[PDB]
């Protein structure tokens, strides 16, 4: 060889650097911005409670997107406003462009008094436009679940702007639904996608009431390290409890059992 060098490669697994950065996510919860419409209004106003937003941020990753389902109701005399009352974490795994949720929507006695309001997901980069993956996901959920009204369900993106998180809420259009339910291209400029597939909706952060989380009854929600155990057909029940952070030990047991070997 150049037998005057001799270098040993030393592993530098990428999840470790990501696990260090995920431990500083809490700093972003003090600087949380909501884009104001300028589109402008579309029907309902969504009020998101800060407590679950902050927790949603703290349990996330900066590269792999995570998602929760939105549930809530209208203030008593006020049909115009949708207060988000619960975020549901279901078994999932993600990449930087999409999340993979089960086909089964949440089912629990506690949600049957509320209505489904859509979903929220983290995004690595802030983007001026709703992802086509997002439009496709939202439209295929609508096709398989009549309970999701096109005029009542939204996508909230929570984008990792530097030192911050910026929230923006979108709804599908009729034309968006029809395009996204038939769409099978995963990439970023799939044929037929266009910006008239969604509108922006007004969203407000509030401190006057608290939301709560539901999580799976047996597993946790994070399968990004146990992907093989995750399946679109998987079934899950729910419990009233708070979600564990992304790199909690229960989400990556093989890191703990294969290090102990030997």
């Amino acid at each position: 060889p150049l037998g005057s060098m001799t270098q040993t490669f030393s592993s530098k697994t990428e999840w470790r650097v990501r696990a260090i950065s995920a431990a500083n996510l809490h700093l972003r919860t003090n600087h949380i911005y909501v884009s104001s419409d300028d589109i402008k209004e579309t029907g309902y106003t969504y009020i998101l409670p800060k407590n679950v937003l902050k927790k949603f941020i703290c349990i996330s990753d900066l590269r792999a997107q995570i998602a929760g389902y939105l549930y809530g109701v209208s203030p008593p005399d006020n049909p115009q406003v949708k207060e988000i009352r619960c975020i549901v974490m279901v078994p999932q795994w993600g990449t930087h462009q999409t999340v993979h949720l089960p086909g089964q929507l949440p089912q629990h006695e506690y949600l049957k008094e509320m209505e489904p309001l859509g979903w929220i997901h983290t995004q690595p980069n802030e983007s001026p436009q709703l992802s086509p993956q997002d439009v496709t996901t939202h439209a295929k959920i609508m096709a398989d679940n009549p309970s999701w009204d096109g005029e009542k369900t939204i996508i909230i993106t929570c984008s990792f702007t530097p030192g911050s998180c910026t929230l923006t809420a979108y709804k599908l259009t009729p034309s968006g639904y029809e395009w996204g339910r038939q769409n099978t291209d995963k990439g970023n400029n799939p044929k037929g996608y266009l910006p008239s597939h969604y509108e922006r909706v007004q969203m407000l952060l509030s401190d006057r009431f608290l939301g709560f989380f539901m999580v799976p009854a047996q597993s946790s929600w994070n399968y990004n390290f146990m992907g093989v155990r995750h399946d679109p057909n998987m079934k899950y029940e729910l419990q009233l409890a708070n979600p564990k952070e992304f790199y909690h030990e229960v989400h990556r047991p093989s890191h703990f059992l294969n290090f102990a070997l030997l």
Partner: protein, 1725 residues
């Protein structure tokens, strides 16, 4: 003091530790010589000659020891030479001792002599030992030594029934050991950490003797621990005056006389120094000092020296070789055995065919381990703690019988086994220290112990110790082993940590205290005697000859370090120290002060596991660890795969410590030798360090981090991560099948109710599905359920029910199992509430109830969470969500009744001159509240409610009503209820003066004796009573005219319906309402209360119209109340009390410098402690005596009357204290002095806050919890007691304001604001208390069917409240089917229990009727549970024996306290006592009262505690006795009833039936009526007939006494008894036979019974009994009181025809020897 100067403590440190060598030179014994050799030098020191033989001393035969001590020397004839010189000083004095002697000279037996002298102090009359009286602490420096001394001393002292034990492991679960152990053997550090906490209830005040073994450890880096211990013990001897004997056992080294000074040893009495001439076997020494500095040649020079030395002994002498690793043990043993092979020299070791050569061939093939099997046939062996215990037992046994020739081992063998060898070789003196991060020299103690093992005591004429070291170490080892290495102090560096320990304890509260404390240190003594060695000039010592300045500087320096690191707050001006929680955690967890500063800086609630491992890795305990280049490749391979990422580079030692911990948890093997020693040191420390982090974050409320840190604690302890199957924690399971289970990633908890079969299948090892099933259900599991109980709209009461759902097994769980209960908020962010929870093995199957408060707010948050998490089991948790979706909040409360700005009301408004004389010179006008309610109370008959803060003159308002009653009815009757006996007494004397003295009515105070009380309400116009006393009477209202004829019923402090004894108060009020509705002649009711938020509910319940309810809130108190609630951080109660001591003083100067102050403290002990503390602070304010406002002269006609010397001292300085232990006369004097203004402060215990006849300008409430000794737990003050203490700050005629400061734990501050600034909500608890009242109402026929019971409930407050706060009562709707269902459930459950206890009958599941049992229970006011057991146990041949047994077993005596300190006292009492029990458990209250009762019948005078306990036992005994009489009677048993009736007499007069009837007479010696039996008198009647002048001449006693015996003789019953069988002729079988009895009283009832030893005044009661004595048959019985004459009628049925002779009994219930017996016959036809 000033000017101080700040020192560099590090510069003063002796860096080399025990290797410090103060002596410049070393003289050797004559005959020593040096040999130059092969680049090493040898020094030889010949063996000494034993010194003989002293002027006058021979060995002492055991014969001549004291007799009690000889048992401890069984198996010896004569003490050795040293024990003989020490036996007098050790066994015949209490003198502190210092014994200096060479190793093995016999110091152990000298300690035993000291122990035996202490043991002797507690031999009682039967020869056993009062093992409750004392503890002995034996401090041994090494763990292996501790264990050997536990067995050695255990064996020697067994014949004394004494427990010797080591302190095993974790102690927040296992201080059981210590109340059971008399001789505790432990290391210095263990005893430090234990006495650093104290808290209590400790047992360290039982410590009478401390033995400091190997006290030359003072010279070690560990030496400061001994200084801390000794200084703490001695200084404590001063402040508590309890002496403790100290025994020092030392090597023979210089400065031993300074050691003696430090131990308070008198050098003329306690100091003994035996030079090396007294070694048991003389020692020939060789020191080999290598000069070769090159590692590898030096290394083989070492083995060359070893081999050459071994050969000088091969075959001749057994060789013990010492090395300092588990690993070099084998490597050296093999290196030696191998180069003998190379040079063919193994034949010298073994005998070509010995008895031994096969004894080790035999045992080697059967020995089972690799290293040993290889060497043992060659005469070689190894020994270390990394191998077996029976292989080590093998090695020790084979060596013992002279079978092994060469044994390589380490220091542990030297310390832990008694194993001498003729020849000892110490191969090298260098050892790896993880603490210092490098190689160092062995400590002195180790070297001494090893070479001590040379020379076997019986076999050898001399021993030969060979020490191989580096040549520059020769002088050091020569000095250590030839009496010349001086013992120095190592404590300047440890000074900050040990000073903080004293501050945390409260022993040191300022820089002066610390200068005093430092004066007790060994450091101080050495500074005085060798200043230069300690950094002090001789010029400076001498301008400062006590080193006063120097100590202040040191203390100054240390305090500044503690303050900079936030352990202490240090005021340089005053020198005061303030404790903190950080400080307390550092002391209690044994953490250095730089570490807890790092923890304070870095810990944040958002911390990740990544950052948590980093924080741990930065602990200063690891500050000497480095990353070596030879470690970096193995560290980086592990850093690559660590499950917890590590931010920092591997070049930082932080990263290496981090990786070592994770590697430990994952149980990795590592190849570097240093790295594994570092791992061991990092992780042994991790345990207490991580438990410190946990306590820090738990008490800060940081939910997420609390979870992480508690889990890391468990991962460290259990050596596994969460992700592993929790069943690995069952170590008795093949780590096989667990890996099986982990392979299948399926959740652990659906193994639970799955069966034995499907377990084996899912795992694919059905081979053992039942075993996995077994362990699955051993795993600890709790089920949680909750009853939510809204208090207000912002406070929620939670009752948590814990149900164990697992099978217990002491093999796995032990005696208990600990948990943390954690109430967390919506976001699992904040711990709203937490407590420790201990599941005891005896309760492993019961439900446990927990109650606590949490705040709530609006709009209601979605849920809280309750987690119950194991303190030790990993993956062992239950989280119960607590959703509020259905929480029904009570309505917010109404506004108060306005206080109207009315013209103040003159006393003239009473328009009655006699009435005005009750008030007119106390004040001119009534306050605003009395002005507003006057018209309604005085000019109306409406039921009225008045709610206002304590101190608003509410009871005057009820006086208004009494006065209106007297106008309407000249002989009208008032019943006044107050909930507290002390309040009833206060009101009694004030109302006695007002209405009897100044108005000529009758004011009476109900006693609780039934017909005494009944006479009182027949005559009194004002009847004052507590609730129970009125309940017993008011139950009988249908038969008792003088109950329904009540004009006025006043209940005071009625808000106490909501407190612990509220239900009886609710019931009797509910009854007065029900009665008034029946009789239709309304009974007026007035209710007085503290401010209530739900006042309208009370008022509606009591029939008060809206205009006649004055619901005032606290802001209207006539004397404005300035209320201050100060929160305190510290969670540990002792330390928190300390943190409050100074603020108590400052509160006085800030809020009431001149005006009177009451300090309420949690306990009797604390009253004294705080009075002295207040004073000590006053003296350092140089304001001594400024609370004394009378002369130091007017004080002392008051003072000399007192018994307590401390109360006199503090009173002399202006400060009294009050507690229930002081004579009633002591309390009155303190109160007079306080109310006269003579003394300005009185410190009162909390239990006195109802019976206090004094008021103050400022009330300080110093903490708000008290220790309940039954439940071994701290209990919050009831809000009612707090309101009552706050009310003592109210001087209407003296102050413009009242002030109160409440100091409480910070977690309680919000609660006190919510419930003191606002009016109080109250609930009923009658629904938990129904049985005894339902039973009474069925007896009285108020309740006759289930519907009646439902209606009855509608009269109660419980029932009004059920619709206002439904959830509190477990109702979910207020609908009328809702509460009519709920009412019926309460009814069905109550009646079913009563019917099953046979108190009532139920017919048609509808109609209820009383049974005799129930009638008895109701009549005597006895728990139906008690009467049920009374019905099981009493039989036809019950005697005085069982009557006392059965009676003690009543539920009324369940709460008689067990005091740990009375255990042997009750044991010895059960031997002083006539009737012996059956296998008595002395932890049982019913056994306890059984003996208190026998003590009382025997007139044994006991402690003040046991006599107050006796007095409450006695307050209940008559009714239980009379109940028994009633049961036995209704069952027809004659002899046991007659016995029960004499029991009544026995208890009343305190005697036995066998006793002399003259024992009842006043002033009667029990000496002289065997002098009275000597001259013809046996009864009382004989004394009265007896001439007068001779009467004064019998008794040998005084004349005032002669009038006392006269008054007794003149009330002693003398009754004439007639009886006639009416129509005695025409009596036919099965017919009525009526016997007529006449009782005429000679005398009067000239007053009540005379019985000075019985606590209540009694009236004479009587039984008339018709029995068949031959048959044991009671046929007729009647109870009667007697005046002059009474006639009694007894009926029964005639039996078959006879010939039937009966016996008539007339029995007293109060006096002995008054009983009469007349036989009579009836001829029946």
């Amino acid at each position: 003091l000033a000017p101080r100067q700040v020192l560099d403590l590090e510069d003063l440190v002796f860096t080399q530790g025990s290797h410090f060598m103060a002596n410049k030179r070393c003289q050797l014994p004559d005959g020593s010589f040096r040999r130059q050799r092969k680049g090493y030098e040898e020094v030889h020191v010949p063996a000494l000659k034993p010194k003989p033989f002293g002027s006058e001393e021979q060995l002492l035969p055991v014969e001549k020891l004291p007799k009690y001590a000889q048992a401890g020397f069984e198996g010896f004839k004569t003490l050795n030479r040293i024990q003989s010189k020490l036996y007098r000083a050790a066994l015949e004095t209490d003198e502190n001792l210092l014994l200096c002697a060479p190793t093995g000279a016999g110091k152990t037996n000298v300690a035993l002599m000291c122990m035996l002298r202490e043991i002797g102090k507690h031999i009682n009359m039967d020869g056993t030992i009062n093992v409750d009286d004392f503890k002995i602490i034996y401090i041994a420096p090494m763990r292996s030594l501790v264990q050997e001394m536990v067995g050695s001393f255990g064996k020697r002292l067994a014949t004394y029934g004494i427990t010797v034990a080591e302190l095993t492991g974790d102690h927040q679960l296992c201080k059981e050991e210590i109340s059971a152990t008399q001789i505790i053997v432990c290391t210095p550090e263990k005893w430090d950490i234990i006495t650093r906490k104290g808290g209590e209830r400790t047992y360290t005040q039982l410590v009478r003797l401390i033995i400091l073994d190997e006290i030359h450890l003072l010279h070690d880096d560990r030496g400061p621990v001994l200084e801390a211990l000794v200084a703490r013990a001695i200084r404590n001897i001063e402040m508590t005056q309890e002496d403790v004997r100290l025994i020092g056992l030392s090597a023979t080294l210089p400065n031993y006389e300074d050691v003696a000074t430090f131990l308070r040893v008198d050098p003329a009495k306690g100091l003994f120094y035996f030079d090396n001439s007294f070694r048991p076997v003389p020692l020939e020494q060789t020191y080999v000092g290598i000069t070769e500095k090159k590692a590898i040649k030096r290394f083989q020079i070492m083995n060359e020296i070893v081999y050459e030395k071994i050969m000088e002994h091969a075959g001749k002498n057994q060789v013990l070789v010492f090395v300092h690793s588990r690993k070099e043990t084998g490597k050296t043993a093999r290196a030696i055995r191998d180069m003998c092979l190379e040079k063919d020299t193994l034949g010298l070791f073994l005998r070509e065919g010995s008895a031994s050569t096969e004894v080790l061939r035999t045992e080697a093939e059967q020995c089972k381990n690799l290293e040993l099997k290889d060497l043992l046939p060659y005469g070689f062996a190894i020994h270390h703690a990394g191998m077996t215990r029976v292989d080590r037992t093998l090695v020790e046994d084979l060596f013992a019988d002279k079978h092994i020739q060469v044994l390589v081992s380490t220091a542990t063998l030297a310390w832990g086994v008694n194993l001498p060898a003729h020849t000892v070789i110490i191969k090298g003196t260098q050892v790896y220290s993880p603490e210092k991060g490098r190689w160092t020299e062995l400590g002195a103690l180790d070297i001494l112990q090893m070479l001590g093992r040379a020379g076997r005591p019986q076999y050898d004429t001399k021993g030969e110790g060979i020490l191989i070291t580096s040549h520059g170490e020769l002088q050091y080892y020569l000095s250590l082993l030839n009496q010349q290495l001086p013992i120095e102090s190592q404590m300047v560096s440890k000074l900050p940590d040990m000073l903080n320990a004293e501050i945390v304890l409260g022993n040191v509260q300022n820089a002066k205290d610390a200068v005093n404390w430092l004066g007790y240190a060994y450091l101080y003594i050495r500074m005085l005697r060798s200043p230069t060695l300690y950094g002090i000039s001789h010029d400076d010592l001498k301008g400062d000859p006590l080193l006063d300045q120097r100590r202040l500087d040191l203390v100054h320096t240390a305090a500044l370090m503690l303050d900079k690191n936030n352990l202490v707050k240090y005021d340089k001006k005053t020198g005061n120290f303030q404790v903190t929680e950080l400080g307390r955690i550092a002391s209690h967890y044994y953490i250095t002060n730089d570490t807890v500063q790092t923890y304070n800086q870095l810990l944040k609630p958002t911390l990740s596991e990544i950052e948590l491992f980093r924080v741990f890795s930065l602990s200063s305990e690891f500050k000497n660890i480095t990353v070596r280049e030879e470690e970096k490749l193995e560290l980086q391979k592990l850093l690559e795969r660590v499950p917890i990422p590590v931010k920092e580079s591997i070049e930082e030692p932080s990263a290496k410590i981090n990786v070592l911990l994770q590697a430990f948890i994952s149980q990795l093997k590592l190849e570097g030798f240093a790295l594994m020693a570092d791992m061991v040191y990092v992780t042994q420390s991790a345990g207490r360090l991580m438990r410190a982090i946990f306590e820090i974050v738990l008490n800060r409320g940081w939910a997420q981090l609390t979870d992480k840190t508690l889990n890391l604690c468990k991962m460290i302890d259990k050596r596994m991560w969460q992700s592993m199957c929790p069943l690995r924690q069952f170590r008795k399971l093949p780590e096989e099948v667990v890996k099986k289970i982990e392979k299948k990633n399926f959740p652990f908890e659906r193994l639970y109710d799955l069966n034995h079969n499907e377990i084996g299948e899912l795992i694919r090892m059905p081979k053992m599905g039942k075993t996995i099933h077994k362990y699955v259900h051993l795993f600890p599991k709790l089920e949680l359920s909750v009853h939510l109980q809204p208090i207000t709209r912002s406070t929620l009461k939670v009752e948590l029910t814990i149900t164990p759902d697992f099978q217990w097994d002491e093999k796995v769980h032990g005696s208990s199992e600990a948990f943390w209960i954690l109430v967390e908020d919506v976001d699992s962010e904040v711990i709203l509430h937490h407590e420790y929870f201990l599941l005891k093995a005896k309760y492993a199957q019961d439900e446990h109830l927990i109650t606590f408060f949490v705040p709530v707010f609006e709009p209601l948050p979605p849920q809280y969470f309750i987690r119950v998490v194991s303190d030790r089991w990993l993956s062992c948790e239950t989280q119960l969500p607590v959703s509020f979706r259905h929480l029904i909040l009570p309505e917010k409360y109404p506004p108060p009744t306005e206080l109207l700005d009315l013209q103040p009301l003159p006393v003239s408004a009473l328009r009655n001159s006699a009435f005005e004389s009750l008030y007119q010179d106390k004040f001119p006008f009534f306050n605003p509240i009395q002005t507003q309610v006057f018209n309604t109370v005085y000019n109306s008959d409406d039921n009225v409610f008045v709610g206002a803060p304590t101190g608003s003159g509410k009871t005057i308002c009820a006086e208004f009503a009494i006065l209106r009653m007297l106008l309407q009815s000249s002989e009208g009757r008032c019943v006044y209820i107050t909930p507290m006996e002390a309040l009833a007494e206060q009101v009694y004397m004030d109302w006695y003066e007002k209405f009897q003295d100044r108005l000529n009515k009758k004011v009476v105070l109900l006693t609780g004796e039934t017909s005494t009380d009944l006479k009182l309400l027949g005559k009194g116009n004002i009847i004052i009573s507590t609730p129970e006393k009125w309940d017993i009477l008011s139950r009988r209202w249908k038969q008792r005219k003088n109950v329904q004829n009540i004009n006025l019923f006043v209940v005071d402090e009625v808000h106490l319906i909501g407190g612990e004894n509220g239900p009886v108060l609710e019931v009797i009020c509910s009854r007065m309402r029900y009665i008034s509705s029946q009789i239709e002649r309304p009974i007026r009711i007035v209710a007085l209360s503290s401010s209530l938020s739900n006042a309208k509910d009370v008022a509606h319940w009591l029939g008060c119209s809206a205009t006649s309810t004055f619901n005032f809130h606290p802001n209207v108190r006539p004397v404005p109340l300035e209320l201050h609630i100060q929160g305190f951080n510290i969670s540990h109660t002792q330390t928190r009390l300390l943190s409050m001591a100074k603020p108590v003083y400052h509160a006085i100067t800030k809020h009431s410098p001149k005006k009177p102050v009451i300090v309420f403290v949690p306990s009797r002990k604390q009253t004294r402690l705080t009075a002295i503390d207040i004073l000590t602070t006053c003296a350092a304010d140089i304001q001594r005596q400024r609370f004394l406002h009378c002369t130091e002269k007017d004080l002392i006609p008051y003072l000399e009357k007192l018994s307590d010397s401390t109360l006199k001292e503090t009173l002399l300085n202006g400060v009294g204290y009050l507690h229930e232990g002081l004579s009633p006369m002591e309390r009155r004097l303190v109160e007079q002095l306080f109310s006269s203004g003579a003394i300005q402060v009185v410190v009162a215990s909390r239990s006195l806050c109802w019976g206090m006849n004094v008021a103050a300008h400022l009330v300080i409430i110093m903490d708000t919890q008290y220790y309940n000794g039954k439940i071994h737990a701290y209990v919050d003050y009831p809000i009612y007691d707090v309101l009552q203490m706050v009310g003592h700050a109210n001087r209407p005629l003296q102050d413009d304001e009242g002030r109160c400061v409440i100091m409480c734990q910070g977690s309680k501050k919000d609660f006190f604001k919510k419930f003191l600034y606002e009016p109080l909500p109250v609930e009923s608890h009658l629904d938990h208390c129904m049985h005894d009242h339902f039973n009474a109402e069925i007896v009285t026929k108020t309740i006759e069917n289930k519907q009646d019971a439902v209606d009855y409930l509608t009269w109660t407050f419980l029932y009004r409240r059920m619709t206002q706060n439904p959830n509190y009562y477990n109702l979910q709707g207020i609908s009328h089917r809702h509460l009519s269902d709920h009412l019926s459930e309460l009814v069905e459950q109550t009646l079913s229990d009563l019917e099953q206890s046979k108190c009532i009958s139920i017919e048609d599941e509808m109609d209820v009727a009383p049974l005799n049992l129930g009638m008895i229970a109701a009549y005597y006011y006895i728990n139906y549970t008690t009467i049920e057991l009374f019905s099981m146990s009493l039989n036809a041949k019950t005697k005085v024996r069982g009557l006392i047994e059965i009676i003690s077993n009543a539920a009324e005596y369940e709460n008689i306290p067990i005091r740990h300190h009375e255990d042997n006292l009750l044991r010895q009492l059960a031997q002083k006592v006539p009737h012996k029990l059956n296998n008595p458990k002395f932890n049982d209250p019913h056994v306890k009262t059984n003996l208190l009762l026998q003590a009382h019948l025997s007139r044994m005078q006991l402690s003040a505690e046991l006599q107050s306990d006796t007095e409450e036992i006695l307050s209940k005994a008559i009714r239980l006795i009379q109940a028994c009489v009633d049961v036995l009677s209704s069952n027809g048993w004659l002899s046991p009833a007659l016995a029960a009736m004499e029991l009544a007499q026995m208890v009343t007069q305190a005697m036995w039936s066998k006793d002399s009837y003259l024992k009842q007479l006043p002033h009667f010696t029990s000496e002289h009526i065997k002098r009275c039996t000597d001259k013809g008198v046996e009864s009382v009647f004989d004394i009265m007939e007896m001439e007068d002048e001779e009467r004064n001449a019998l008794l040998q006693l005084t004349d005032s006494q002669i009038a006392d015996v006269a008054r007794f003789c003149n009330r002693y019953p003398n009754i004439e008894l007639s009886y006639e069988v009416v129509d005695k002729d025409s009596i036919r079988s099965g017919g009525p036979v009526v016997v007529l009895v006449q009782l005429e009283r000679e005398e009067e009832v000239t007053g009540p019974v005379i019985a000075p030893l019985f606590p209540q005044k009694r009236e004479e009661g009587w039984w008339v009994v018709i029995g068949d004595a031959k048959s044991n048959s009671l046929i007729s019985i009647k109870r009667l009181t007697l005046q002059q004459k009474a006639k009694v009628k007894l009926d029964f049925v005639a039996p078959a025809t006879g010939a039937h002779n009966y016996t008539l009994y007339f029995m007293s219930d109060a006096y002995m020897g008054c009983d009469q017996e007349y036989k009579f016959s009836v001829d029946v036809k």
